[PDB]
Design a protein around this motif. Structure first.
Motif, PDB file in Angstrom:
ATOM      1  N   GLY A   1       0.826  -1.229   0.000  1.00 22.50           N
ATOM      2  CA  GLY A   1       0.000   0.000   0.000  1.00 22.50           C
ATOM      3  C   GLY A   1       0.845   1.258   0.000  1.00 22.50           C
ATOM      4  O   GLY A   1       1.901   1.304   0.631  1.00 22.50           O
ATOM      5  N   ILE A   2       0.372   2.287  -0.692  1.00 19.77           N
ATOM      6  CA  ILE A   2       1.095   3.528  -0.818  1.00 19.77           C
ATOM      7  C   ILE A   2       0.937   4.387   0.429  1.00 19.77           C
ATOM      8  O   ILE A   2       1.664   5.358   0.628  1.00 19.77           O
ATOM      9  N   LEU A   3      -0.026   4.036   1.264  1.00 20.60           N
ATOM     10  CA  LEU A   3      -0.188   4.700   2.543  1.00 20.60           C
ATOM     11  C   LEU A   3       0.712   4.028   3.564  1.00 20.60           C
ATOM     12  O   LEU A   3       1.122   4.622   4.559  1.00 20.60           O
ATOM     13  N   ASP A   4       1.051   2.793   3.260  1.00 20.74           N
ATOM     14  CA  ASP A   4       1.924   1.992   4.108  1.00 20.74           C
ATOM     15  C   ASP A   4       3.365   2.451   3.972  1.00 20.74           C
ATOM     16  O   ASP A   4       4.102   2.498   4.952  1.00 20.74           O
ATOM     17  N   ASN A   7       3.544   5.344   5.923  1.00 22.01           N
ATOM     18  CA  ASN A   7       3.490   4.896   7.313  1.00 22.01           C
ATOM     19  C   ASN A   7       4.860   4.457   7.812  1.00 22.01           C
ATOM     20  O   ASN A   7       5.282   4.821   8.911  1.00 22.01           O
TER      21      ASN A   7
END
Length: 13
Positions: A1-4, A7
């Protein structure tokens, strides 16, 4: 994930 990736970079700091 690109939010990961955000993160994890945020975590590392």
């Amino acid at each position: 994930g690109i939010l990961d990736i955000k993160n994890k970079v945020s975590n590392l700091f």
